């Protein structure tokens, strides 16, 4: 009967929880951008825009016994109010599979859900690391003022450490000091794996060296993970939703609304 008609909620609480835990675990096991970017608090599906803030320039601050030195306040250079896109992926579940799960009292088969969650994670990583140039979004590789540094010292006993230092020096000159995060392409990641250099990299970074497939063949970034530099406005994380039905099958969609805001663009240095 439930299959013999169109319905708003085919699954039950157990199946919904299974879907949610599956997509949550796949996201936790697949995401790499969220491991070096802080996420802004959840807003909800209602909110569609966030204030894209810029804080270029540094004002040192003041120390005084009475507390009157008149240092410049920190405020947005220019409000932009960018809109939050949606990253989604569609999978299909069979009505006979759902009925079999109900009759056998067994967990639902969510392999398609896991695949959709993995592809949604890949798309989120692509959006975070690179822009799209169609919606006017900026990524870690596309932001203006990336402090590009030469990288051509590979296949050498010291190369790699030397690069992760030059970016550090530029960041310190611009005013960034926190524990860095280094995200690298698999090729040069293994090239650092050669001489044990990754052990040196991981402890100068003090916040993580990661590998992402979404980067180019030979590319990498050293970023300052501290807040007021990069943020992820999150309307709602990965959830499973019912996209109607067609041919008696149940299509679902993994959904997540993110927006990367690089508040102070000098906190990123791309080892191009």
């Amino acid at each position: 009967p439930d299959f013999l008609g169109h319905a708003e909620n085919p699954l039950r609480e157990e199946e919904w929880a299974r879907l949610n835990e599956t997509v949550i675990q796949v996201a936790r096991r697949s995401l790499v951008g969220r491991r070096i970017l802080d996420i802004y608090g959840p807003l909800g599906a209602g909110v569609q825009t966030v204030p894209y803030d810029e804080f270029q320039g540094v004002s040192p601050g003041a120390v005084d016994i009475v507390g009157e030195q008149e240092t410049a306040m920190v405020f947005t250079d220019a409000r932009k109010f960018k809109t939050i896109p949606i990253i989604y992926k569609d999978f299909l579940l069979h009505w006979r599979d759902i009925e079999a799960a109900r009759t056998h009292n067994m967990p639902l088969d969510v392999s398609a859900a896991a695949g959709a969650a993995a592809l949604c994670a890949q798309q989120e990583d692509e959006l975070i690391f690179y822009g799209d140039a169609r919606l006017g979004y900026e990524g870690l590789m596309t932001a203006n003022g990336r402090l590009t540094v030469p990288l051509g010292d590979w296949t050498s006993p010291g190369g790699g450490f030397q690069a992760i230092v030059e970016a550090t020096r530029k960041l310190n000159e611009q005013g960034h000091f926190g524990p860095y995060a280094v995200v690298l392409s698999p090729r040069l990641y293994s090239q650092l794996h050669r001489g044990g250099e990754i052990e040196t990299i991981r402890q100068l970074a003090s916040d993580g060296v990661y590998q992402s497939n979404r980067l180019r063949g030979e590319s990498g970034v050293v970023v300052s993970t501290g807040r007021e530099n990069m943020d992820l406005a999150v309307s709602m994380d990965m959830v499973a939703a019912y996209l109607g039905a067609s041919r008696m099958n149940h299509p679902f969609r993994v959904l997540e609304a993110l927006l990367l805001r690089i508040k102070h663009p000098d906190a990123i240095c791309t080892l191009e």
Partner: peptide, 12 residues
């Protein structure tokens, strides 16, 4: 009911 964060921030 209350809006929540399904997948948490991957810090620490």
């Amino acid at each position: 009911p209350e809006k929540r964060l399904t997948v948490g921030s991957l810090r620490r």
